[PDB]
Design a protein around this nucleic acid. Structure first.
Ligand SMILES: CC(=O)O[C@@H]1[C@@H](O)[C@H](O[C@H]2[C@H](OC(=O)[C@H]3CC[C@@H]4[C@H](C3)O[C@@]3(C[C@H](OC(=O)/C=C/c5ccccc5)[C@H](C)CO3)[C@]43CO3)O[C@H](C)[C@@H](O)[C@@H]2OC(C)=O)O[C@H](C)[C@H]1O
Ligand SMILES: [Mg+2]
Ligand SMILES: [Mg+2]
Ligand SMILES: [Mg+2]
Ligand SMILES: [Mg+2]
Ligand SMILES: [Mg+2]
Ligand SMILES: [Mg+2]
Ligand SMILES: [Mg+2]
Ligand SMILES: [Mg+2]
Ligand SMILES: [Mg+2]
Ligand SMILES: [Mg+2]
Ligand SMILES: [Mg+2]
Ligand SMILES: [Mg+2]
Ligand SMILES: [Mg+2]
Ligand SMILES: [Mg+2]
Ligand SMILES: [Mg+2]
Ligand SMILES: [Mg+2]
Ligand SMILES: [Mg+2]
Ligand SMILES: [Mg+2]
Ligand SMILES: [Mg+2]
Ligand SMILES: [Mg+2]
Ligand SMILES: [Mg+2]
Ligand SMILES: [Mg+2]
Ligand SMILES: [Mg+2]
Ligand SMILES: [Mg+2]
Ligand SMILES: [Mg+2]
Ligand SMILES: [Mg+2]
Ligand SMILES: [Mg+2]
Ligand SMILES: [Mg+2]
Ligand SMILES: [Mg+2]
Ligand SMILES: [Mg+2]
Ligand SMILES: [Mg+2]
Ligand SMILES: [Mg+2]
Ligand SMILES: [Mg+2]
Ligand SMILES: [Mg+2]
Ligand SMILES: [Mg+2]
Ligand SMILES: [Mg+2]
Ligand SMILES: [Mg+2]
Ligand SMILES: [Mg+2]
Ligand SMILES: [Mg+2]
Ligand SMILES: [Mg+2]
Ligand SMILES: [Mg+2]
Ligand SMILES: [Mg+2]
Ligand SMILES: [Mg+2]
Ligand SMILES: [Mg+2]
Ligand SMILES: [Mg+2]
Ligand SMILES: [Mg+2]
Ligand SMILES: [Mg+2]
Ligand SMILES: [Mg+2]
Ligand SMILES: [Mg+2]
Ligand SMILES: [Mg+2]
Ligand SMILES: [Mg+2]
Ligand SMILES: [Mg+2]
Ligand SMILES: [Mg+2]
Ligand SMILES: [Mg+2]
Ligand SMILES: [Mg+2]
Ligand SMILES: [Mg+2]
Ligand SMILES: [Mg+2]
Ligand SMILES: [Mg+2]
Ligand SMILES: [Mg+2]
Ligand SMILES: [Mg+2]
Ligand SMILES: [Mg+2]
Ligand SMILES: [Mg+2]
Ligand SMILES: [Mg+2]
Ligand SMILES: [Mg+2]
Ligand SMILES: [Mg+2]
Ligand SMILES: [Mg+2]
Ligand SMILES: [Mg+2]
Ligand SMILES: [Mg+2]
Ligand SMILES: [Mg+2]
Ligand SMILES: [Mg+2]
Ligand SMILES: [Mg+2]
Ligand SMILES: [Mg+2]
Ligand SMILES: [Mg+2]
Ligand SMILES: [Mg+2]
Ligand SMILES: [Mg+2]
Ligand SMILES: [Mg+2]
Ligand SMILES: [Mg+2]
Ligand SMILES: [Mg+2]
Ligand SMILES: [Mg+2]
Ligand SMILES: [Mg+2]
Ligand SMILES: [Mg+2]
Ligand SMILES: [Mg+2]
Ligand SMILES: [Mg+2]
Ligand SMILES: [Mg+2]
Ligand SMILES: [Mg+2]
Ligand SMILES: [Mg+2]
Ligand SMILES: [Mg+2]
Ligand SMILES: [Mg+2]
Ligand SMILES: [Mg+2]
Ligand SMILES: [Mg+2]
Ligand SMILES: [Mg+2]
Ligand SMILES: [Mg+2]
Ligand SMILES: [Mg+2]
Ligand SMILES: [Mg+2]
Ligand SMILES: [Mg+2]
Ligand SMILES: [Mg+2]
Ligand SMILES: [Mg+2]
Ligand SMILES: [Mg+2]
Ligand SMILES: [Mg+2]
Ligand SMILES: [Mg+2]
Ligand SMILES: [Mg+2]
Ligand SMILES: [Mg+2]
Ligand SMILES: [Mg+2]
Ligand SMILES: [Mg+2]
Ligand SMILES: [Mg+2]
Ligand SMILES: [Mg+2]
Ligand SMILES: [Mg+2]
Ligand SMILES: [Mg+2]
Ligand SMILES: [Mg+2]
Ligand SMILES: [Mg+2]
Ligand SMILES: [Mg+2]
Ligand SMILES: [Mg+2]
Ligand SMILES: [Mg+2]
Ligand SMILES: [Mg+2]
Ligand SMILES: [Mg+2]
Ligand SMILES: [Mg+2]
Ligand SMILES: [Mg+2]
Ligand SMILES: [Mg+2]
Ligand SMILES: [Mg+2]
Ligand SMILES: [Mg+2]
Ligand SMILES: [Mg+2]
Ligand SMILES: [Mg+2]
Ligand SMILES: [Mg+2]
Ligand SMILES: [Mg+2]
Ligand SMILES: [Mg+2]
Ligand SMILES: [Mg+2]
Ligand SMILES: [Mg+2]
Ligand SMILES: [Mg+2]
Ligand SMILES: [Mg+2]
Ligand SMILES: [Mg+2]
Ligand SMILES: [Mg+2]
Ligand SMILES: [Mg+2]
Ligand SMILES: [Mg+2]
Ligand SMILES: [Mg+2]
Ligand SMILES: [Mg+2]
Ligand SMILES: [Mg+2]
Ligand SMILES: [Mg+2]
Ligand SMILES: [Mg+2]
Ligand SMILES: [Mg+2]
Ligand SMILES: [Mg+2]
Ligand SMILES: [Mg+2]
Ligand SMILES: [Mg+2]
Ligand SMILES: [Mg+2]
Ligand SMILES: [Mg+2]
Ligand SMILES: [Mg+2]
Ligand SMILES: [Mg+2]
Ligand SMILES: [Mg+2]
Ligand SMILES: [Mg+2]
Ligand SMILES: [Mg+2]
Ligand SMILES: [Mg+2]
Ligand SMILES: [Mg+2]
Ligand SMILES: [Mg+2]
Ligand SMILES: [Mg+2]
Ligand SMILES: [Mg+2]
Ligand SMILES: [Mg+2]
Ligand SMILES: [Mg+2]
Ligand SMILES: [Mg+2]
Ligand SMILES: [Mg+2]
Ligand SMILES: [Mg+2]
Ligand SMILES: [Mg+2]
Ligand SMILES: [Mg+2]
Ligand SMILES: [Mg+2]
Ligand SMILES: [Zn+2]
Lengths: 100, 159, 103, 185, 144, 59
RNA sequence: GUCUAACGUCUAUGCGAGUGUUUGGGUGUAAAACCCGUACGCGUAAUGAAAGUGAACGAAGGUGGGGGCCCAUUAGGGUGCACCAUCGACCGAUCCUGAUGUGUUCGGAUGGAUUUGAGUAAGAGCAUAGCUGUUGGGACCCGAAAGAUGGUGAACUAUGCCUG
RNA sequence: GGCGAAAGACUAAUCGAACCAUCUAGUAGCUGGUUCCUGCCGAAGUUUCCCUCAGGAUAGCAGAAGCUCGUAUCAGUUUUAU
RNA sequence: UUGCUUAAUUGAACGUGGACAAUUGAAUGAAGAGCUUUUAGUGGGCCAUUUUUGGUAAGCAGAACUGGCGAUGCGGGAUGA
RNA sequence: CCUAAGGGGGACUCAUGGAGAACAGAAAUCUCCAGUAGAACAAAAGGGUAAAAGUCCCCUUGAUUUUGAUUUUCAGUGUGAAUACAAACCAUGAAAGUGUGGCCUAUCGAUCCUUUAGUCCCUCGGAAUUUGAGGCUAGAGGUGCCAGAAAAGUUACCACAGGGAUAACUGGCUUGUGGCAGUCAAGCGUUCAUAGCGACAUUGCUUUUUGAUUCUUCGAUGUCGGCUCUUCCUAUCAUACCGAAGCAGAAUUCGGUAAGCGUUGGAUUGUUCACCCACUAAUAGGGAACGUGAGCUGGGUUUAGACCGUCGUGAGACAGGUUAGUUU
RNA sequence: GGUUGCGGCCAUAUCUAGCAGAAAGCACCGUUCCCCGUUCGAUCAACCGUAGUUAAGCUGCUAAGAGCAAUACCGAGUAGUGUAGUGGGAGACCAUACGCGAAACUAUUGUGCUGCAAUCU
């Protein structure tokens, strides 16, 4: 059971693992269907853009201090500073975040 | 029950020589050992500190370390299909200089002396040793030594 | 075995670094705390059903124990520990041997 | 019958050809098989043997190794020969003008050699300007720096690297690696 | 076995020349129960070298069919001919070692007329092993 | 049951197929186990020796 | 004696202090081929339980060898990559010493030590594939006596009852 | 579980714990088997540890891949000295 | 050269420079020497000569060295590991 | 087991013998001489030791601290044990020196947990203080199956995987044991070793005893005895022919050639064996897979039911007794 | 050459019994105030070199001496042993072949050699 100068392994296969094997044969099919869904959304709302405007926020933790990424919504103070009500902003393609 | 202690089976190996027990003659403590010296190992039963194991009794090796009362000797021991380098710390009572050095070191001097003499005389000399060769021809004089004839003797009982 | 109640050995205390006088005492194991993590873990594992969850030693073979001397420096109060060999009989500061006496 | 003093029918144990099926490496072997067979120059016989070597037997030569070899006394204008890949070294502060013949050059290496006025030629171009390897200097990369060699000859008190998947305080550090946990080897 | 290997006697009916001293004498003494040896005459050496003489050239067994092979391999030892080689063997010369090691071990046939009734006993006791001295010439005559 | 207890038969055959090899000799033996006091000073003597030879060649 | 997840050695290949397009996005003659990039994985730094600290005295060291190359002219000299043996240097841990100073208990300069690390000492790795070997999986194929869960039986039979 | 004027007896030819399906391809250091050719090489039953004694791990013996070199310095042998 | 050692300018170890040239220091041999990685099977043995233990002995049990059988056909021992 | 029985130094010389001294004798204490160790050194044995390692006295704690290297077992892993040094701090001695437990070779113990000592150092992760907890290094608590599970029985109701790697038949080697036979001849035999015997010794044979072993068989060779029947051996009980006698006859005993020919009926017992009764010329001993169960029988042994005695708390055991129990 | 001090090898030096010993040395020898140690100035410590002696120690010589050491036409190429045979013998064991080769025994000879320093008829 233990033999030779080999690394000691941790292969977690002592349960009925073979009843829960998900093989993504449909990777290409989901890619294609996602593109078709995306086309449908675009044709549904044209010429209105498919993407809501997202804010820019600093990433948390000491490891991602340096990076900055897309947030979820503009703060109430930020929308107040440009004179847009959040209820109105959600209807003109602007994302709101009451939490930030 | 098996017994396999450190000094098992050393009843006669570690005995003192007959009529040679007791105090150590002091030339043993006056000899000087240098790193690289070739030494014979012979355990002295009367000194139990720095005593060799029974394997090294009768072995010859190279001094590698010199301490207050001891020398370190390098021995090559067979372990299976190879040699392992063994480093044994031995008090100088169990150690003696090997006499094999003095024969070869003298032959080196003799070869050097003979070569310069032949070089001085402008001749050549051969320094390689030779095994004993079959003897040459010879003439046996029989003056006073005329051959005496022997015969096998009859059987006798002497009790 | 008889061991005197005082001894002069090396003291490892930073102040001393030398042989000083020490007080010899037999070491006694301290009381087992209830909040040591191994005892904390043991109580949790034994709780509930399942019976005895850890082994109980039975096959005793030793008939003695190693005596440990507690050496307290009289100068700096630093303690030191010395284990002795296995002895069936041990006294500390007993009556010293009297050689030459009669039966 | 014969009392055999050696094993019978034993292959030499050396490569006599590349294991590679690259046709262009065969052409280089074609050229130096002819050169080694016919020039009496020891350089060409060495090159032919080195062309057979496996990837781990031709470790990459950094452009820093060539710089140090050219810094030998009287070797500044020698032709550096590398039977293998020449890699770049971004830790160098400067590189000289040099002629280097190699199997392969990295993008940084070729840029650096040509930037400093040198040439980056192949081994067939070497064979015409130096058919006997005159005024050359063969450079080999470090063989014992490979990661697999860390674990070779592992054992007690050998100081080699354990074959291990994770590294940390919980991974092969307690008993046999520490006197407080029994012994240490 | 090691002694026979060091004498290059690794098959039956293999013959080799040995210069008698002490080291080689104690060697032959160790191999004595397995070999027949003796003192060869000049004609025996000549016949051996002429019919079954081979040289070791690049570790190959090459027939001694021309004096150029001998010169090319032993001219630095002053051997330029097959007769130089025979002389160097017979009157044991200063280059006996090189000449005898250059000679491939002679691969003789079995005796024409057979051996004695039982080989593996000393020549003195009516067998074939050991030193037969001048009868080595008759034995080689049977086998070469 | 009862089996064979011990035998050294065939063990010299196995040791002599590829072993019975004398150890290689090198010009410099390892100084492992040599006296620390000598080893400490031998470090200073060798370092000074290298300096003297370096200066003589630099001249 | 298989396939798979994760691995050891060796080999071939691409690129190389980097490497891996395929999670995803683009694209398409549509599960293909072609294209894209942020991250991330591994590698590029180790050591200590940790707080932490963190790799050039020197031409990135000396000595004895060392293929090849250079000068020669048997010989001889120079240079000597890989690699071997040996003596050193640097980083971390452990122990010793303890400068100017100071939240007076912190700081830790400087100089050391038969101690110790899977380190540095002009990077070698990453990825794909193949054989062989390993571990978990039904695990080369067939094989228990057993254990568990949930159900079906008193048409035989055992016993009680009711009616003949 | 039943049932037993008690034999561990009867409980559908099944009883010292029925039948049916599933967990289940249960596990087995133990049996048995294990499918084409030729070529080259070619063993071990020995060391140490193991609730180890029909089994493993470990070292040894063997194969394969080779690598650095090219007579360098090796040997199941002798001689001489000790 | 040193921080070791000596009363020392004594030694210890490692060195610079110089001399001793192919009989460079016995024989014989050498399908060359050295090195590395990885992995199989095996881990019941038995026999012969000699040494040898227990036992009255054993086609018995147990060791030593070597050679064999096992794993091996061929000629002989009629037959036979 | 030992605060000395460890360490250092010093002084002395033990076992024993001889010759002497009131009580005093084989043994009390004193004296001289001799005394190579013939003693003593904790303990088994071996080695070692004499101005000592033994005996006595004085001083002590080196039986201490930090850890590396090495030797043995060895895989050159662990453990145990030991060796020579490095850096300290000490003891002793005038000093040189010696001392890192016991003169040497045995005298012992991992992970996990706990506890103590040390560093008073690191952490409890939003920041602190103090408790508490967790870390690092060294000991102790222990695994004696001693490289170290936590562990009672029974099955005659029984199961499975296997094993001739291993017992219970036959067979094979051996022949202690059993059985049978020789030789040497001290004695026996009224005299008289050998008509017939024959001690102390010693040489053999046999395989109908019992041992010894475990080679064959455990995907099975039907394990007792009897009945029935055939054949073979001879170490011959009877019958034939002979030789010998301590053979007058009659009877009897020993032997040679001899297995041609026969060797029984019953009471008790499952018996093999035994023992009795009786006839007979005699009622010899054996083999043939301890011949012979697809020939029988099934009394015994040895499944399951049941009784008793002894044993066991009990389930149950008994190679103890008893009764019933499928022979294809 | 003798002698002393310090030695190396550690009996050719030891052991027993006799005899001899010039010079110097050594020794025995004389004393107890002092340092010191004892039951005892016997040992140990100290003092004198003054009163005496080679009696002893020590040294040398003697002994068909014991022991020890060395040697060998001593025993003996014996015992033993490595290797060999399809040698002998029922066996136990034995012979032969190529090699190695004792111990006891017997005889003879010997009985310390020597280094450093100082000293002496
Ligand atoms: C009553 C009784 O006798 O049973 C005790 C049991 O009570 C004890 O359980 C303790 C329990 O034991 C364990 O968890 C294991 C820890 C280590 C293992 C083992 C038991 O102890 C061992 C064995 C051996 O030392 C002993 O034996 C330990 C005795 C002990 C007793 C009390 C507390 C701690 C230890 C090794 C030296 C290492 O330590 C170890 C490797 O086997 O630890 C808890 C902390 C304690 O509370 C608990 O003690 C109490 C009061 O019940 O474990 C012992 C082995 C049993 O003998
Ligand atoms: Mg016993
Ligand atoms: Mg014994
Ligand atoms: Mg001896
Ligand atoms: Mg000791
Ligand atoms: Mg010459
Ligand atoms: Mg203290
Ligand atoms: Mg803890
Ligand atoms: Mg709870
Ligand atoms: Mg509860
Ligand atoms: Mg539970
Ligand atoms: Mg529980
Ligand atoms: Mg052939
Ligand atoms: Mg072969
Ligand atoms: Mg080779
Ligand atoms: Mg350039
Ligand atoms: Mg590197
Ligand atoms: Mg590395
Ligand atoms: Mg790894
Ligand atoms: Mg691992
Ligand atoms: Mg020859
Ligand atoms: Mg012979
Ligand atoms: Mg004819
Ligand atoms: Mg014919
Ligand atoms: Mg004939
Ligand atoms: Mg003939
Ligand atoms: Mg014939
Ligand atoms: Mg014949
Ligand atoms: Mg004859
Ligand atoms: Mg012919
Ligand atoms: Mg068994
Ligand atoms: Mg076995
Ligand atoms: Mg070999
Ligand atoms: Mg992989
Ligand atoms: Mg794709
Ligand atoms: Mg599609
Ligand atoms: Mg990254
Ligand atoms: Mg990256
Ligand atoms: Mg990384
Ligand atoms: Mg730490
Ligand atoms: Mg540390
Ligand atoms: Mg200040
Ligand atoms: Mg200040
Ligand atoms: Mg200050
Ligand atoms: Mg500062
Ligand atoms: Mg390091
Ligand atoms: Mg590096
Ligand atoms: Mg598998
Ligand atoms: Mg698998
Ligand atoms: Mg199944
Ligand atoms: Mg089931
Ligand atoms: Mg269960
Ligand atoms: Mg149910
Ligand atoms: Mg159920
Ligand atoms: Mg009914
Ligand atoms: Mg129920
Ligand atoms: Mg119910
Ligand atoms: Mg019942
Ligand atoms: Mg019923
Ligand atoms: Mg049914
Ligand atoms: Mg049914
Ligand atoms: Mg039916
Ligand atoms: Mg049924
Ligand atoms: Mg299966
Ligand atoms: Mg072969
Ligand atoms: Mg088993
Ligand atoms: Mg194995
Ligand atoms: Mg082996
Ligand atoms: Mg191999
Ligand atoms: Mg070599
Ligand atoms: Mg010899
Ligand atoms: Mg000699
Ligand atoms: Mg020189
Ligand atoms: Mg010679
Ligand atoms: Mg393998
Ligand atoms: Mg292997
Ligand atoms: Mg293996
Ligand atoms: Mg295996
Ligand atoms: Mg077997
Ligand atoms: Mg097996
Ligand atoms: Mg044989
Ligand atoms: Mg024989
Ligand atoms: Mg046997
Ligand atoms: Mg057997
Ligand atoms: Mg087999
Ligand atoms: Mg054969
Ligand atoms: Mg045949
Ligand atoms: Mg045959
Ligand atoms: Mg026959
Ligand atoms: Mg003592
Ligand atoms: Mg004492
Ligand atoms: Mg004492
Ligand atoms: Mg004393
Ligand atoms: Mg006496
Ligand atoms: Mg202790
Ligand atoms: Mg050990
Ligand atoms: Mg052990
Ligand atoms: Mg080991
Ligand atoms: Mg070891
Ligand atoms: Mg150890
Ligand atoms: Mg030792
Ligand atoms: Mg000391
Ligand atoms: Mg413990
Ligand atoms: Mg554990
Ligand atoms: Mg918190
Ligand atoms: Mg905090
Ligand atoms: Mg412990
Ligand atoms: Mg065990
Ligand atoms: Mg065990
Ligand atoms: Mg148990
Ligand atoms: Mg049970
Ligand atoms: Mg029953
Ligand atoms: Mg029963
Ligand atoms: Mg059997
Ligand atoms: Mg008998
Ligand atoms: Mg009998
Ligand atoms: Mg009789
Ligand atoms: Mg029998
Ligand atoms: Mg049987
Ligand atoms: Mg059976
Ligand atoms: Mg069958
Ligand atoms: Mg059968
Ligand atoms: Mg049947
Ligand atoms: Mg049968
Ligand atoms: Mg049967
Ligand atoms: Mg039958
Ligand atoms: Mg039966
Ligand atoms: Mg008859
Ligand atoms: Mg008839
Ligand atoms: Mg009846
Ligand atoms: Mg009847
Ligand atoms: Mg009876
Ligand atoms: Mg039968
Ligand atoms: Mg029969
Ligand atoms: Mg029978
Ligand atoms: Mg029968
Ligand atoms: Mg029948
Ligand atoms: Mg039947
Ligand atoms: Mg029957
Ligand atoms: Mg019928
Ligand atoms: Mg029956
Ligand atoms: Mg019956
Ligand atoms: Mg009965
Ligand atoms: Mg019954
Ligand atoms: Mg009762
Ligand atoms: Mg009874
Ligand atoms: Mg009964
Ligand atoms: Mg009755
Ligand atoms: Mg009935
Ligand atoms: Mg039927
Ligand atoms: Mg004179
Ligand atoms: Mg005078
Ligand atoms: Mg006086
Ligand atoms: Mg005095
Ligand atoms: Mg006088
Ligand atoms: Mg006088
Ligand atoms: Mg005398
Ligand atoms: Mg013989
Ligand atoms: Mg031999
Ligand atoms: Mg023979
Ligand atoms: Mg014949
Ligand atoms: Mg002879
Ligand atoms: Mg005398
Ligand atoms: Zn203190």
């Amino acid at each position: 059971a233990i033999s030779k100068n080999l690394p000691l392994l941790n292969n977690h296969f002592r349960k009925h693992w073979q009843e829960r094997v998900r093989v993504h044969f449909d990777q290409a099919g989901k890619k294609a269907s996602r593109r078709q869904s995306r086309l449908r959304k675009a044709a549904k709302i044209a010429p209105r853009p498919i993407d809501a405007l997202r804010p820019v926020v600093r990433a948390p933790t000491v490891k991602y201090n340096r990076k900055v990424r897309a947030g979820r919504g503009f703060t109430l103070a930020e929308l107040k500073a440009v004179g847009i009500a959040p209820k109105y902003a959600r209807t003109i393609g602007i994302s709101v975040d009451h939490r930030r | 029950g098996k017994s396999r202690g450190y000094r098992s089976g050393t009843r006669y190996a570690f005995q003192r020589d007959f009529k040679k027990h007791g105090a150590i003659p002091l030339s043993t403590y006056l000899k000087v050992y240098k790193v690289g010296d070739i030494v014979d190992i012979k355990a002295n039963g009367s000194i139990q500190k720095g005593m060799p194991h029974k394997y090294y009794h009768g072995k010859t090796g190279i001094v590698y370390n010199v301490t207050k009362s001891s020398v370190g000797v390098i021995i090559n021991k067979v372990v299976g299909n190879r040699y392992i380098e063994k480093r044994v710390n031995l008090r100088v009572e169990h150690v003696k200089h090997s006499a094999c050095r003095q024969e070869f070191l003298n032959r080196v001097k003799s070869n050097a002396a003979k070569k310069r003499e032949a070089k001085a005389n402008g001749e050549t000399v051969y320094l390689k040793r030779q095994a004993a060769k079959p003897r040459g021809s010879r003439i046996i004089s029989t003056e006073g030594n005329i051959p005496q004839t022997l015969a096998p003797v009859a059987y006798e009982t002497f009790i | 075995v008889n061991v005197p109640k005082t001894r002069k050995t090396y003291c490892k205390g930073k102040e001393c670094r030398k042989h000083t006088q020490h007080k010899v005492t037999q070491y006694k194991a301290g009381k087992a705390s209830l909040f040591a993590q191994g005892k904390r873990r043991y109580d949790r594992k034994q709780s509930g059903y399942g019976g005895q969850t850890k082994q109980i030693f039975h096959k005793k073979a030793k008939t003695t124990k190693k005596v440990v001397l507690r050496l307290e420096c009289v100068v700096c109060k630093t303690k030191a520990q010395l284990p002795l060999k296995r002895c069936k009989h041990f006294e500390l500061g007993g009556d010293k041997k009297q050689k030459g006496q009669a039966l | 019958g014969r009392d055999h003093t050696s094993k019978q029918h034993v292959r030499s144990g050396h490569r006599t050809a590349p294991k590679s099926d690259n046709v262009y490496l065969q052409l280089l072997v074609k050229l130096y098989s002819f050169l080694a067979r016919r020039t009496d120059a020891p350089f060409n016989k060495v090159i032919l043997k080195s062309l057979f070597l496996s990837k781990i037997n031709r470790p990459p030569v950094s452009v820093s190794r060539i710089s140090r070899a050219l810094k030998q006394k009287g070797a500044a204008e020698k032709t550096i020969v590398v039977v293998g890949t020449v890699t770049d070294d971004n830790r160098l502060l400067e590189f000289p003008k040099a002629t280097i013949a190699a199997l392969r050059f990295t993008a940084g290496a070729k840029d650096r050699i040509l930037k400093n006025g040198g040439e980056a030629i192949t081994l067939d171009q070497l064979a015409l300007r130096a058919p006997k390897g005159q005024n050359t200097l063969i450079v080999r990369g470090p063989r014992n720096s490979r990661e697999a060699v860390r674990h070779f000859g592992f054992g007690p008190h050998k100081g080699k690297a354990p074959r291990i998947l994770s590294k940390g305080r919980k991974f092969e550090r307690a008993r046999g690696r520490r006197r407080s946990r029994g012994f240490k080897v | 076995r090691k002694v026979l290997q060091l004498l290059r006697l690794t098959q039956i009916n293999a013959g080799v020349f040995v210069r008698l001293t002490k080291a080689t004498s104690e060697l032959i003494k160790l191999a004595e129960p397995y070999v027949a040896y003796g003192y060869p005459s000049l004609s025996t050496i000549r016949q051996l070298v002429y019919k079954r003489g081979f040289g070791k050239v690049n570790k190959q067994r090459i027939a001694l069919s021309d004096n150029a092979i001998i010169e090319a391999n032993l001219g630095k030892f002053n051997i330029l001919s097959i007769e130089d080689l025979i002389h160097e063997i017979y009157t044991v010369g200063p280059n006996f070692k090189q000449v005898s090691n250059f000679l491939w071990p002679f691969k003789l046939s079995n005796p024409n007329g057979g051996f004695r009734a039982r080989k593996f006993q000393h020549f003195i006791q009516g067998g074939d092993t050991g030193n037969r001295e001048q009868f080595i010439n008759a034995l080689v005559k049977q086998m070469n | 049951a009862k089996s064979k207890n011990h035998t050294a038969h065939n063990q010299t055959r196995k040791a002599h197929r590829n072993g019975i090899k004398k150890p290689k000799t090198y010009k410099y033996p390892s100084l492992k186990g040599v006296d620390a006091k000598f080893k400490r000073n031998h470090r200073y003597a060798l370092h000074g020796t290298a300096k003297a030879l370096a200066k003589a060649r630099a001249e």
